[PDB]
Amino acid sequence: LQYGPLAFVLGERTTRKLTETSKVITVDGNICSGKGRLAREIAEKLGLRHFPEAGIHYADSTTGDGKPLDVQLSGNCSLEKFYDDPKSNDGNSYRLQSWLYASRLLQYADALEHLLSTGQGVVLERSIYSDFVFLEAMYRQGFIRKQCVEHYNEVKKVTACEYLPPHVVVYVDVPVPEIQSRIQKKGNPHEMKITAAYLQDIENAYKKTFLPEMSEKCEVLQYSAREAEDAEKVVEDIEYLKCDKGPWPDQDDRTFHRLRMLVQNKLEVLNYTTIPVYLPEITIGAHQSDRVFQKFTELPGRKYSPGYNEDVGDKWIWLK
Amino acid sequence: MNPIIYTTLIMTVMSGTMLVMISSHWLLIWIGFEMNLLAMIPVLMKNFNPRATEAATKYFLTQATASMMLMMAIIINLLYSGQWTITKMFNPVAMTMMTMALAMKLGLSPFHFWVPEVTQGISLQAGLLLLTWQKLAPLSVLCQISQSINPNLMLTMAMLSILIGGWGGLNQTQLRKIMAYSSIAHMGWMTAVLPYNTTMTILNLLIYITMTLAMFMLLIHSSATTTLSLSHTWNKMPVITSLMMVTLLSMGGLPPLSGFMPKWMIIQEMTKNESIIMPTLMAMTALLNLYFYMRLAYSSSLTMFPSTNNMKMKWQFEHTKQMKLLPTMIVLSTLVLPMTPALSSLN
Amino acid sequence: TMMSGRPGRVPLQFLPNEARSLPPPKLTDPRLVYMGFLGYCSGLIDNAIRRRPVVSAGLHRQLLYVTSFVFFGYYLLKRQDYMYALRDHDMFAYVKSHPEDFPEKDKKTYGEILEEFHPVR
Amino acid sequence: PPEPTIRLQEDPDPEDENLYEKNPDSHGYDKDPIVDLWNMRVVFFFGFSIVLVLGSTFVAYLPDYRMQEWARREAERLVKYREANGLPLMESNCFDPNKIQLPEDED
Amino acid sequence: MLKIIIPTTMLLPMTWMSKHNMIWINATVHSLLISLISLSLLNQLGENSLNFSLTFFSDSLSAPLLVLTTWLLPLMLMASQSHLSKETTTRKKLYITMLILLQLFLIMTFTATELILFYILFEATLVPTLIIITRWGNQTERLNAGLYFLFYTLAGSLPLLVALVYIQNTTGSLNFLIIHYWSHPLSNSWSNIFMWLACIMAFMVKMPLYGLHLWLPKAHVEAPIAGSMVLAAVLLKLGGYGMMRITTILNPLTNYMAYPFLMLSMWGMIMTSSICLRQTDLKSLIAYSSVSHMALVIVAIMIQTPWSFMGATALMIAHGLTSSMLFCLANTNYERVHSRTMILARGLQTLLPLMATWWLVASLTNLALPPSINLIGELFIITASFSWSNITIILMGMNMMITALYSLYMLITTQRGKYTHHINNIKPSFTRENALMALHILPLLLLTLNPKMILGPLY
Amino acid sequence: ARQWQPDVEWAEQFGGAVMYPTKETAHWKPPPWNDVDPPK
Amino acid sequence: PHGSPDWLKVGLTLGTSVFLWIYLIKQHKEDVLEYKRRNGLE
Ligand SMILES: CCCCCCCCCCCCCCCCC[C@@H](O)O[C@H](CO[C@H](O)CCCCCCCCCCCCCCC)COP(=O)(O)OCC[N+](C)(C)C
Ligand SMILES: CCCCCCCCCCCCCCCCC[C@@H](O)O[C@H](CO[C@H](O)CCCCCCCCCCCCCCC)COP(=O)(O)OCC[N+](C)(C)C
Ligand SMILES: CCCCCCCCCCCCCCCCC[C@@H](O)O[C@H](CO[C@H](O)CCCCCCCCCCCCCCC)COP(=O)(O)OCC[N+](C)(C)C
Ligand SMILES: CCCCCCCCCCCCCCCCC[C@@H](O)O[C@H](CO[C@H](O)CCCCCCCCCCCCCCC)COP(=O)(O)OCC[N+](C)(C)C
Ligand SMILES: CCCCCCCC/C=C\CCCCCCCC(=O)O[C@H](COC(=O)CCCCCCC/C=C/CCCCCCCC)COP(=O)(O)OCCN
Ligand SMILES: Nc1ncnc2c1ncn2[C@@H]1O[C@H](COP(=O)(O)OP(=O)(O)O)[C@@H](O)[C@H]1O
Numbered sequence A: 001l002q003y004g005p006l007a008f009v010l011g012e013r014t015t016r017k018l019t020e021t022s023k024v025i026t027v028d029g030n031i032c033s034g035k036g037r038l039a040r041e042i043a044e045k046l047g048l049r050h051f052p053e054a055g056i057h058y059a060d061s062t063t064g065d066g067k068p069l070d071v072q073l074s075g076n077c078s079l080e081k082f083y084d085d086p087k088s089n090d091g092n093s094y095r096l097q098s099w100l101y102a103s104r105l106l107q108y109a110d111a112l113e114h115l116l117s118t119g120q121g122v123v124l125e126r127s128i129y130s131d132f133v134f135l136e137a138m139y140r141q142g143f144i145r146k147q148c149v150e151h152y153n154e155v156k157k158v159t160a161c162e163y164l165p166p167h168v169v170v171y172v173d174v175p176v177p178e179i180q181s182r183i184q185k186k187g188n189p190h191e192m193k194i195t196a197a198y199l200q201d202i203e204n205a206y207k208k209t210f211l212p213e214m215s216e217k218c219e220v221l222q223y224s225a226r227e228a229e230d231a232e233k234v235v236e237d238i239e240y241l242k243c244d245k246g247p248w249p250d251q252d253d254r255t256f257h258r259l260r261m262l263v264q265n266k267l268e269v270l271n272y273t274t275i276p277v278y279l280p281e282i283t284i285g286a287h288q289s290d291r292v293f294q295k296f297t298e299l300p301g302r303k304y305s306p307g308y309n310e311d312v313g314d315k316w317i318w319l320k
Numbered sequence B: 001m002n003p004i005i006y007t008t009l010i011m012t013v014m015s016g017t018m019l020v021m022i023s024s025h026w027l028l029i030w031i032g033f034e035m036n037l038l039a040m041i042p043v044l045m046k047n048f049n050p051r052a053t054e055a056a057t058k059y060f061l062t063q064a065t066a067s068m069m070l071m072m073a074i075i076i077n078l079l080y081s082g083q084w085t086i087t088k089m090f091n092p093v094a095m096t097m098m099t100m101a102l103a104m105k106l107g108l109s110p111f112h113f114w115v116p117e118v119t120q121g122i123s124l125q126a127g128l129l130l131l132t133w134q135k136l137a138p139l140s141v142l143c144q145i146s147q148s149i150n151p152n153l154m155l156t157m158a159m160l161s162i163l164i165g166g167w168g169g170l171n172q173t174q175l176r177k178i179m180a181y182s183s184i185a186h187m188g189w190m191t192a193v194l195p196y197n198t199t200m201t202i203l204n205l206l207i208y209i210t211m212t213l214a215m216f217m218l219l220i221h222s223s224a225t226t227t228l229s230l231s232h233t234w235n236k237m238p239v240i241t242s243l244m245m246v247t248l249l250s251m252g253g254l255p256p257l258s259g260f261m262p263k264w265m266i267i268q269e270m271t272k273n274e275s276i277i278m279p280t281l282m283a284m285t286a287l288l289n290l291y292f293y294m295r296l297a298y299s300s301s302l303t304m305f306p307s308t309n310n311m312k313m314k315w316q317f318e319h320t321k322q323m324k325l326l327p328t329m330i331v332l333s334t335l336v337l338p339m340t341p342a343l344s345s346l347n
Numbered sequence C: 001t002m003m004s005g006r007p008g009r010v011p012l013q014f015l016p017n018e019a020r021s022l023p024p025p026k027l028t029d030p031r032l033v034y035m036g037f038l039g040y041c042s043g044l045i046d047n048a049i050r051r052r053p054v055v056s057a058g059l060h061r062q063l064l065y066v067t068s069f070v071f072f073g074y075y076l077l078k079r080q081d082y083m084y085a086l087r088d089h090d091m092f093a094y095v096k097s098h099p100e101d102f103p104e105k106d107k108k109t110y111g112e113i114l115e116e117f118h119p120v121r
Numbered sequence D: 001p002p003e004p005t006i007r008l009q010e011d012p013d014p015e016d017e018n019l020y021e022k023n024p025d026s027h028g029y030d031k032d033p034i035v036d037l038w039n040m041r042v043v044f045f046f047g048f049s050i051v052l053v054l055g056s057t058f059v060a061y062l063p064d065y066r067m068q069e070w071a072r073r074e075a076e077r078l079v080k081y082r083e084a085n086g087l088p089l090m091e092s093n094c095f096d097p098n099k100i101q102l103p104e105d106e107d
Numbered sequence E: 001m002l003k004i005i006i007p008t009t010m011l012l013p014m015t016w017m018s019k020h021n022m023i024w025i026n027a028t029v030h031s032l033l034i035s036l037i038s039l040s041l042l043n044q045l046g047e048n049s050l051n052f053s054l055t056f057f058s059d060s061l062s063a064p065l066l067v068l069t070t071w072l073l074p075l076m077l078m079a080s081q082s083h084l085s086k087e088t089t090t091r092k093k094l095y096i097t098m099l100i101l102l103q104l105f106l107i108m109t110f111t112a113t114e115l116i117l118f119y120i121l122f123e124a125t126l127v128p129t130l131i132i133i134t135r136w137g138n139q140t141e142r143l144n145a146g147l148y149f150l151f152y153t154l155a156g157s158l159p160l161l162v163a164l165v166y167i168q169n170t171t172g173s174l175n176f177l178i179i180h181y182w183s184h185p186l187s188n189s190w191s192n193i194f195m196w197l198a199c200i201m202a203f204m205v206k207m208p209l210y211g212l213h214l215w216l217p218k219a220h221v222e223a224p225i226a227g228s229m230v231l232a233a234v235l236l237k238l239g240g241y242g243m244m245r246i247t248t249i250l251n252p253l254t255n256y257m258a259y260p261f262l263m264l265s266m267w268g269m270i271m272t273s274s275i276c277l278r279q280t281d282l283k284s285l286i287a288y289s290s291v292s293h294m295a296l297v298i299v300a301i302m303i304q305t306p307w308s309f310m311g312a313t314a315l316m317i318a319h320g321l322t323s324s325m326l327f328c329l330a331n332t333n334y335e336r337v338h339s340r341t342m343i344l345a346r347g348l349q350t351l352l353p354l355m356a357t358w359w360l361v362a363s364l365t366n367l368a369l370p371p372s373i374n375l376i377g378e379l380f381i382i383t384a385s386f387s388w389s390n391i392t393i394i395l396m397g398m399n400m401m402i403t404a405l406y407s408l409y410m411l412i413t414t415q416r417g418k419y420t421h422h423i424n425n426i427k428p429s430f431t432r433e434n435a436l437m438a439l440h441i442l443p444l445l446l447l448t449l450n451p452k453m454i455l456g457p458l459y
Numbered sequence F: 001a002r003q004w005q006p007d008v009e010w011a012e013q014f015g016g017a018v019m020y021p022t023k024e025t026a027h028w029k030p031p032p033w034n035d036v037d038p039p040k
Numbered sequence G: 001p002h003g004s005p006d007w008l009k010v011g012l013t014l015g016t017s018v019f020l021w022i023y024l025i026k027q028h029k030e031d032v033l034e035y036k037r038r039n040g041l042e
Helices: A005-010 A035-046 A079-084 A092-118 A132-141 A146-160 A176-186 A196-215 A231-240 A253-263 A286-297 B003-022 B026-044 B050-080 B092-106 B114-121 B124-133 B136-144 B151-171 B175-191 B198-221 B227-235 B238-251 B260-272 B277-302 B326-334 B337-345 C017-021 C030-049 C059-097 D033-060 D068-084 E002-016 E023-042 E062-080 E089-111 E115-124 E127-135 E142-171 E176-181 E190-206 E215-222 E225-235 E237-246 E259-277 E282-303 E306-337 E353-366 E373-388 E392-415 E431-447 F008-015 G007-039
Strands: A025-029 A122-124 A168-173 A219-224
Touching: A005 B003, A025 A035, A035 A122, A035 A168, A035 A231, A079 A092, A092 A122, A092 A132, A092 A146, A092 A253, A132 A146, A132 A196, A168 A196, A176 A196, A196 A219, A219 A231, B003 B026, B003 B124, B003 B136, B026 B050, B026 B124, B026 B136, B050 B092, B050 B114, B092 B136, B092 B151, B114 B124, B114 B175, B124 B175, B124 B198, B136 B175, B136 B198, B151 B175, B151 B277, B175 B198, B175 B260, B175 B277, B198 B238, B198 B260, B198 B326, B198 B337, B227 B238, B227 B277, B227 F008, B238 B277, B238 B326, B238 C030, B260 B277, B260 B337, B260 E142, B277 E127, B277 E142, B326 C030, B337 C030, B337 C059, C017 C059, C017 G007, C030 C059, C059 G007, D033 E023, D033 E062, D033 E431, E002 E023, E002 E089, E023 E062, E023 E089, E062 E089, E062 E225, E062 E237, E062 E306, E062 E431, E089 E115, E089 E127, E089 E225, E089 E237, E115 E142, E115 E237, E127 E142, E127 E225, E142 E190, E142 E215, E190 E237, E215 E225, E215 E282, E225 E237, E225 E282, E225 E306, E237 E282, E237 E306, E259 E282, E259 E392, E282 E306, E282 E373, E282 E392, E306 E353, E306 E373, E306 E431, E353 E392, E353 E431, E373 E392, E373 E431
Parallel strands: A025 A122, A025 A168, A168 A219
Antiparallel strands: none
């Protein structure tokens, strides 16, 4: 019995499962920061569930086998090519940005579904909120055009007007020279090509816009590089603050039921990520779409429904 | 809203329609219309937004005016003959006013202006319910008094409705407005045979309801509202586009598909009463409906429009909710021509 | 025709008692076979929409579709045949009861009938 | 104008594949040589050998249902009978006058 | 008849459960087998008909058209085998399904003892054709062509439905036997004039008549090869067959209602023959040739004499086969050239001799050379029109001369002369194309031996 | 060598508010992707 | 998802189909018997 209006009618009330410990938390930081390490510690200490940052092949992990598919069949973009050629002629920058934003939207929907179904809270890296800072960095550096940010804004507003912002925002602050040194120490051959201006734009786009917007409606915990190492103080700060300004207290059983119906059925979640606006960076010709879709169908467990694949090994096909 | 409240409101709408259909008193019929209107408004406003509110208020104003006109007609009929039973109207003015009231309720031209806007403002589910279920009470009332209706008024209103639906469907791009104009044209077709044979009216109503239910369920399945959103569908579920094109061809009156059964039969009936010019005019007018259906089919299935990159992610997820009776609706709306004589069942 | 107001009609009976005086349709009726074919088409379309192996996804579901369609088709055919029998019975009774309006035609032979001849040239 | 001048992402137009280059004796039917050869065989056998010849002979030897020889024999007998007895061959009136009744005019 | 209809229906499950690399073989073999079964229908008798049952009957007018319809499908499959190489299995199966549905609808149409069933299938033949034209078409004008083809036909044929139901209301039956036996003269009245126009225009639009032929060049140019052959060979004969079936109730009104259509056809034959001379396209030229021949058939049917009907049937069959062959040859040229222009590729006879022979034979047959059935039908219609009026011979002779001129122009421009230098992808002709041309042409030279099989019921 | 399929330029014809744009309706705007208007 | 053949639904569907077929056969037999009785054939 999957969740539905009937289950809500009989027994399924999601306001009972919330026990003041849910507290959906997003840990946001600058490129190559210690936030990932910090997020893991918070989830371990508070008993929540940690969601690793959504990448190019995040959606491939949740459908069928967790093994990622080919780059052509999932994303059609690469981060290394963006680092090597930020001003690539074939519009790789926007395609990467949109695929990452939609992956983050899917991850947020999955996290909300888990929270509402189980009651155990979640910890996230950069969410759909704060993802616009990378777009601003790309635009100011000149990587993408203005129509690009207009389309991104349209998609973002349409998709995000239906989700609850996170309870707590945790920000790790690292100065630009320090993270440049960290990048040099990292050793990834593509990452030292990141210009200092790009990181400065990311940081000041974080500080000037995202932080006040989260502050006016949520709780903000700005942490420096040193003081973020001690997770005990972070957890104590998380417990001490009380959430009374966001929409979460105003939600009831009916609104929670509507949100739980929305977060599952991922097609509606991703419905507006493919609005019919034809930018050259994201649009695909008919022949290319046909060929790629045909190649996708030939994958082992993708021709039919999940339970109706003979080659994978599903049996009793003629009676399901 | 709460699922229990939504179910209760739907039951109340159906109960109002049933009360209209099973009652032999004018006052009880008016009560059924009032109950239907009262419970139908929140269904339009299930998804709260300014467009839904404006559509709901337009619908309320039109329905309230129609109900008041209907009550005035009932009062005049009672005055000139102390009878409450729904039978011969016994008065020309009362019959004329009741015909206008039922035209307002149905959506026949020139009282058709509210249908496209109400359909556009409200959601697909609300629109589907409004387009098919609402027609049952006014059509039943019109069938019950078909022996008294003036043929001139009904025939001219039906002709105007067909013309207006055909002309207005050409311009629209949003699918909901196309469906509204399609409904207007189909009702112009269906009410033209009321003075002659009500069985043809019922048969056309059933066929139209099946076709529009199938098309609205297909539109809900592939969540598309504008034409381009429908053009994007072929990249994910080509079967849906193919079935939608077949249903669109059926809705245009192309034989041997099911949609040809009513028109043909209706023409036959009007030929038995030595009415030749009008059926020809309505056929050449339905050619316009066929044209914009064909344009929609060209946009949707017969050609492959450019896609979008993010659509790749939609390839990995399946439709979680499946609506039952969709295959049955498609089959009934496409391949039931060879069983045409079953209309003798007085359906 | 408007047999709705026909006297002695039960308001909500699908098949009146007198309809039992007519031969039931054979189980191998072509129309019943067509209803079975419609049911099979519905089953195939249901398999196609759900993204399942179209021919051999659910045999029980296709069987249920076929059986339901055949059942409804059989009863619908019985009602249709009864209604047509009623129409013919009323027609014949009325033509018998009003001999004045349906006079016997004075039978004539082509030998004593002058039809104009239009040559084709 | 930093626009890429590319309207959309598209595969390049592929060049036509010659069926002879990878397979001489290509028959122009299919790229799989065995299926191709058998397609040619069945097409030639059922088109020329079975239909075009057996069907032609069948049509040639169709029984005379049009009744041409029967009509010739009937005409021969009629002509012989009418010549022997001095009758004037073909008759002007298709139907005998006595059977036919003409409405009187009296005008 | 069900021995023919049932196997055509079984062709669909046969195709859909075939292996991915064996659909063409099975479809071709069983289509040819079906054609052999259809051969039995040809043995007509001088009496009424082969009344199989209450729903289907066969005449000596329906038999040749039925045999041609059943014979065309294997050729359509062999023609479509070329450009569908890079197509997915589902779409190829859908294409074969459309072709099979078209054949089934045509087979049910040509017998159709009742006129309403005939009309229903006559309009049912319109959906698979439109899908084929608008889906598997190369040019971007296939959409406009499909719209023109749909609406030109439907606007003409919609009043026909009203006329038919009116006739059923008054006459009481639409069965063709009862209609023929109980026929009564049509008085000269405005209502009867409009009944005549309604019953005639639906078939004259599809033939097509000059002035309503605008849809035919578009539909023939933008369609794929199989759609082109099925349009030129069988779909054009529906109008003439319907007209010869339905003119049995329009007498004696036709005696003076045929003047506008006779004049239109007798002048449009000259106009389209002249148009063929100045043409930059091959498929358009062949389409206009088809228009000219169908105008001649219209004249023959409207004359309404036994020789007219015999010549009309012979010309129908001959033109169907010849136009199908010409479209095949044009498609084979276009596949190598990829341009579809007459003067872009020249002197192909030096490079492809056997295809030059096929071109010569097809042009000679189109040129109405004796003793081919093309000239048999042509000459019968000429003699009948001469009996109608002695002045028609001028127009008919002018048409004959222009027909010869444009046929030999088509042959010379594409075959003779010096080859174009900058084309080096003219590969040797496959066995498939040669077999296709042979199977197109041999039935014509075989039917010239037994003309009585295609001379219609008035033989 | 390739079957023609609609491109962006062909698809933009159906992207307007209504077909056959005129002077009066040139200033009309398509409804939002979701049926929600700004609260202003 | 990870779903086994639901034997409850399969059993219900088979039972419904078999019951409907048996009922149809019995109804046809009774109808033909009643018609033969009324018309006095057998
Ligand atoms: C696509 C075509 C429409 C299909 C509609 C859906 C089919 C499923 C419906 C299931 C059965 C319907 C009714 C249920 C049976 C019990 C109800 C029964 O008692 O009603 C009787 C009546 O039965 C129904 O009317 C007959 C229903 C049959 C509808 C099918 C006819 C469609 C004809 C063309 C398509 C051929 C069938 C295609 C496959 C279904 C009482 O008649 P009566 O109260 O005294 O007269 C009222 C009407 N008046 C007022 C005008 C006089
Ligand atoms: C390559 C170089 C040449 C090599 C070849 C050398 C050999 C020369 C032979 C070629 C032609 C020479 C002429 C010889 C003709 C003799 C045969 C002829 O007399 O038979 C004809 C018979 O032929 C057939 O009638 C014609 C063929 C039938 C046409 C059907 C076509 C096959 C089906 C394919 C589909 C059709 C598509 C179009 C549908 C309409 C005429 O029949 P008929 O004189 O009376 O009497 C027959 C015997 N009777 C008395 C018992 C009755
Ligand atoms: C030396 C001989 C020269 C002449 C040879 C002529 C051979 C002609 C063969 C071609 C025949 C054409 C097909 C004819 C089909 C029409 C007739 C058909 O419908 O009749 C059916 C009967 O058809 C036959 O039973 C089957 C014939 C099918 C096969 C024909 C032979 C060639 C088949 C080749 C198939 C492939 C061969 C193997 C390839 C690998 C049903 O008959 P029915 O309506 O009950 O009859 C009632 C009257 N009765 C009672 C007196 C009988
Ligand atoms: C454009 C491409 C081709 C399309 C199809 C063309 C074919 C359509 C043409 C119609 C055929 C003829 C129509 C009427 C024929 C009747 C003879 C009549 O025209 O002649 C005179 C009739 O006089 C006048 O013509 C009256 C009619 C005038 C109004 C008709 C419109 C004329 C021009 C319109 C042309 C538009 C054609 C295309 C429309 C889209 C004789 O006078 P009278 O002997 O006393 O009456 C004879 C009839 N009776 C005996 C039953 C009484
Ligand atoms: C490619 C485009 C071709 C378009 C073809 C359209 C024109 C077809 C010809 C006219 C079609 C309508 C005719 C009506 C159908 C016939 C029914 C009939 O015959 O009944 C007549 C009725 O006749 C009519 O009603 C005809 C009215 C016509 C109204 C529609 C006019 C359409 C255009 C007319 C001019 C077109 C003619 C030339 C068209 C050329 C092609 C463009 C008998 O009347 P009763 O009631 O029985 O009277 C008996 C007691 N006295
Ligand atoms: N919208 C985006 N655009 C470009 N790159 C992104 C985007 N989102 C995430 N990334 C990439 O994800 C990588 C991991 O982020 P980061 O947290 O800084 O490193 P780590 O996971 O080691 O802590 C980074 O290299 C960053 O560039």
